[PDB]
Amino acid sequence: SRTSMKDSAGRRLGPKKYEGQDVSTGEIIMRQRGTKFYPGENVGIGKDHSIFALEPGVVRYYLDPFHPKRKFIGVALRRDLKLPSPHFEPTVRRFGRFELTNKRAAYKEENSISR
Amino acid sequence: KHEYAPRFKIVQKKQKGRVPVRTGGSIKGSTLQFGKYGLRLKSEGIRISAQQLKEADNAIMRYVRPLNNGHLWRRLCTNVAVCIKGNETRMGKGKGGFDHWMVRVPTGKILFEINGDDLHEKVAREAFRKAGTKLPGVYEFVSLDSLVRVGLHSFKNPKDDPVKNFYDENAKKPSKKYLNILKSQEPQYKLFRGR
Amino acid sequence: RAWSGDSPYHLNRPPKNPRGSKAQLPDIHPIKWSNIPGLESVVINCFVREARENQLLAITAALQLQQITGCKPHPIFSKNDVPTWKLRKGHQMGAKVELKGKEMSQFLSTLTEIVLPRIREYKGISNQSGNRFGGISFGLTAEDIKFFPEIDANQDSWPKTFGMHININTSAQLDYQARTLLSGFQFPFFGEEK
Amino acid sequence: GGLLWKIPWRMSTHQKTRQRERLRNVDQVIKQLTLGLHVQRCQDKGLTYQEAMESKKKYKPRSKSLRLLNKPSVFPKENQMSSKDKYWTFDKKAVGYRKGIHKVPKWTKISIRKAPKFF
RNA sequence: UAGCCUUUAUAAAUAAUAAUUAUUAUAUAAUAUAUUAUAUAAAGAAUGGUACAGCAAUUAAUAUAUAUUAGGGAACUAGUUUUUUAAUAAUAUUAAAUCUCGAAAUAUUUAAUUAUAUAUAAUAAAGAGUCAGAUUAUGUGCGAUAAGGUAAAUAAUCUAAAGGGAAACAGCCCAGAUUAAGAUAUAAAGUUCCUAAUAAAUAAUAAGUGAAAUAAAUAUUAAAAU
RNA sequence: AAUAUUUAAAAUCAAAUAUAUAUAUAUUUGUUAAUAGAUAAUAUACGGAUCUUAAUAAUAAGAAUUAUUUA
RNA sequence: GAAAGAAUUAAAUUAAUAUAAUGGUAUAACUGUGCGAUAAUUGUAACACAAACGAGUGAAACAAGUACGUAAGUAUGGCAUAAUGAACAAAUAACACUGAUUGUAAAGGUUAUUGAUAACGAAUAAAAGUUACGCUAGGGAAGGGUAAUAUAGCGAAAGAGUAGAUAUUGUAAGCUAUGUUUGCCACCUUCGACUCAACAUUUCCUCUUGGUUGUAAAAGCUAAGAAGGGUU
Ligand SMILES: [Mg+2]
Ligand SMILES: [Mg+2]
Ligand SMILES: [Mg+2]
Ligand SMILES: [Mg+2]
Ligand SMILES: [Mg+2]
Ligand SMILES: [Mg+2]
Ligand SMILES: [Mg+2]
Ligand SMILES: [Mg+2]
Ligand SMILES: [Mg+2]
Ligand SMILES: [Mg+2]
Ligand SMILES: [Mg+2]
Ligand SMILES: [Mg+2]
Ligand SMILES: [Mg+2]
Ligand SMILES: [Mg+2]
Ligand SMILES: [Mg+2]
Ligand SMILES: [Mg+2]
Ligand SMILES: [Mg+2]
Ligand SMILES: [Mg+2]
Ligand SMILES: [Mg+2]
Ligand SMILES: [Mg+2]
Ligand SMILES: [Mg+2]
Ligand SMILES: [Mg+2]
Ligand SMILES: [Mg+2]
Ligand SMILES: [Mg+2]
Ligand SMILES: [Mg+2]
Ligand SMILES: [Mg+2]
Ligand SMILES: [Mg+2]
Ligand SMILES: [Mg+2]
Ligand SMILES: [Mg+2]
Ligand SMILES: [Mg+2]
Ligand SMILES: [Mg+2]
Ligand SMILES: [Mg+2]
Ligand SMILES: [Mg+2]
Questions:
Q1: Which end of chain C, N or C, is less packed with Cβ atoms under 10 Å?
Q2: φ/ψ (deg, to 5) at B80
Q3: Per the database entry, which stretches of residues form a coiled coil (chain C)?
């Protein structure tokens, strides 16, 4: 006969970074088929709908009244911040860059311009 | 009349499974609904086959046909497929071929239930007894005044189950998604959704 | 219908279908000064089944519609594949046109005043016709289409002519109101009404 | 079939007595944990050991595990339990839906107190 | 090769292991309904769809002196009295490996705190063995709800574990032998003799039933509730 | 004392817990036996002995079975 | 009171998705449309997921240039998960790296590209059978378990039995017993005859007994006790 012994190995899907966990840029938070979890803020979504943090912070799972029937995963820039942040409140942003105190480095950056 | 031969479009082999043990106190199928006397399992949950059920059916029909407007209701359907293999075979080589249909009967379910204008309790008892002698478990007689068997040695009454609405319970102990929907219907979100 | 909340499984369960129908039906309001029935549109359907073998008959049918009505016809294209009828998909089988205002008024006036009186054995429109929420449909054959002024004027240019269905859409809440309205516009009715 | 694991289907009086004592011992452990938490709460509030023990108002535990273990409907005490559930445990592959609690592996250490209402 | 083991060490080291606080609500107070505080209740921060439960949608089953459709059953020149077959509605019942509208416990897992430091984790140099596994429990696939069967999934033990109990006993119950001693408290198991150690209470058995491997449908004789 | 389903702690009833001090809510537990069916091949196999009690009647026995328990 | 807007609510992902199945999708990922055909481009790629290796997957950011957009911005192929193959040896192009006395060459290297090892981590460019004449080194990679089958009993009784399910009989199904049969597992690698038999009883004969419109007698059928003797 024709034996039925063909199958594909389990795709290692599921949450790869849990709530309250600290994350850095690019780290993968969730691997999924389709958008079971949508991206919130400070987080992006890839070709295969992989959720990945865009800034350092703390991972939070939440729900947003603007998008009922939609789960969200996002990154809070501090632990003490509830992630479904108030709508009419200035966005929390991270400058990220550092000032070039070194004279030579400042000179090079000043003299570097685009094509 | 296909209770002993379901009409599945794609006939498919099925895994063995286990006969459910209803530890949540389920009484689905353990009440009289269509008739006035009935037959219910009394021993542990077991498996019945189409041939056995048909034999019990004709055993009861031998008593139900000689009646005035007498009817028999079959509460069970053989909705599981089973496979067999020849004895002169080594283990393995896949599954076998379809052999028969079967049904999983838990402890309290009712198999048959009958009614009739000229029906008499003693006649019903003898009919159901003779029918039970042709099935692979232990069976008992049920009337409209009889309690519902929820276990091997435990009965209960459907009137004890409280009637309660669940919308109100959900409202009083909301879910996070429900609260999110409610808070989405508020104007400060609806008026700014942007879609 | 809505599920009674006697079981928890009813919390997020989608609502049930209407009792007798798989589609919801509209409510019927009393007739008042603001909602009197009236004609809202007319649509003519011309499906030349013999165009399955000849695509030019569709153009001829469109010209028939344009001359009768005066509006721009719109093509009809096959959608289903039925072998017994030798109907493929994606081919031009006829034309349609929708009429409103003065143009539909003229079309109905000319119908009633010229064409319907010139039919051989015409008793009117069936009293058991029309969608149950306002709207009356009736057909015309090729010989009937030959009675229109434009065709009669230049018979030479009409070796073949095609029939068509006519759908009158009104504001009537129910069909009998639309029947009364059309009778006012002089449309005879012969059958026994529902 | 082949091996002889001569485990009798019913316990003896001595085995039953030992099982009763073990159940009671676990009950005592739970009681002592709750009492210690109460005395700690009193001492944190300011009282001393003597009137912490003599306090009319006993503080109940605020942890899920301790609260549930203290509820009789979740972890019934030995004297509350039934004779059936003291010695027999629920099995769905056995005639009568029961098996001797002494056929459970490591039965003198693990604890079973509750079986389904109608089983 | 990875996995499991071993030797020697490294610090801007506790990063490891375990549990608690996270929540919702009530009451009583305050402070400024909203908080904060105390007490209490709830299987109690985030993730998930198994049991259970259910028949929603899908896939299947039953019924009707209730309706639509078709051939249409004594009068008959189109229209019935009807325990007439099938399909579609209505109502009421049912189940499923590839059905979950409800939904556990265990579980995954986060920060801080507490406990474990005669202790974990990580890292550096270097050295192996192993890649035939076996039972006992609990969920399963196959087999026939067979096998001291076979295939994998959680413990545990044997493997590589002496000692007590299971009569005898690789895998079961308890407990891990550095060497002695033998006073004390014991685990599992037991206390008529063989054989270390017991005295009682309340009912039932009369069949040596049974007493350390419970054999079924059924039949007879006996027990109380109205 | 007679016609007499069912083998039950769900429901009711009775005792107890946690809140309550003039009483109520919630929770936990308590609902049958004996015999027959019975079943092979070196030898009866609870491990063996043996184990059910009885006035007169003496220091002095009366389950060593089953079900709940005590010291 | 009425028109025309803006839309809101319920329902819907069952249609459609380039292609299986699953997850996702109306805020559309589905559909229509204008530009466009551009990002189906170039040099570094952190960090994660997955993971023995070798490979695979998501991707922030820096730099060069494109297309669309008023702008914000989007685009490093397709809603996602399959659509594939190492190194050696050859071949084509570019690079300006080395040029075995020097110069150029030849040849090698770097960058890009091609052909498939489907036993699909691919022995070689290139390979089938037979031994009952066989040889060496090893492992075993009738008893034991099971009772589907076979045999036997029991419960119930549809039907035969001139009449009456139970004298006899008992046809599908139900509950068990044996381990004599045919199989199943893999712990453990001679059929018949002659001679002598020992043991069991599920008794063929011999003794005792119950039933039998179906025991008048005789001969029988069925069943209970019975293993002393006998059984070509
Ligand atoms: Mg898979
Ligand atoms: Mg179920
Ligand atoms: Mg290694
Ligand atoms: Mg769900
Ligand atoms: Mg499943
Ligand atoms: Mg810590
Ligand atoms: Mg191996
Ligand atoms: Mg094995
Ligand atoms: Mg060990
Ligand atoms: Mg070894
Ligand atoms: Mg040992
Ligand atoms: Mg002993
Ligand atoms: Mg020993
Ligand atoms: Mg005995
Ligand atoms: Mg109760
Ligand atoms: Mg013997
Ligand atoms: Mg696509
Ligand atoms: Mg889909
Ligand atoms: Mg990892
Ligand atoms: Mg790697
Ligand atoms: Mg696209
Ligand atoms: Mg050069
Ligand atoms: Mg040279
Ligand atoms: Mg070259
Ligand atoms: Mg190969
Ligand atoms: Mg390979
Ligand atoms: Mg591979
Ligand atoms: Mg080859
Ligand atoms: Mg030869
Ligand atoms: Mg007869
Ligand atoms: Mg038979
Ligand atoms: Mg005999
Ligand atoms: Mg005679």
A1: N
A2: -130, 140
A3: none
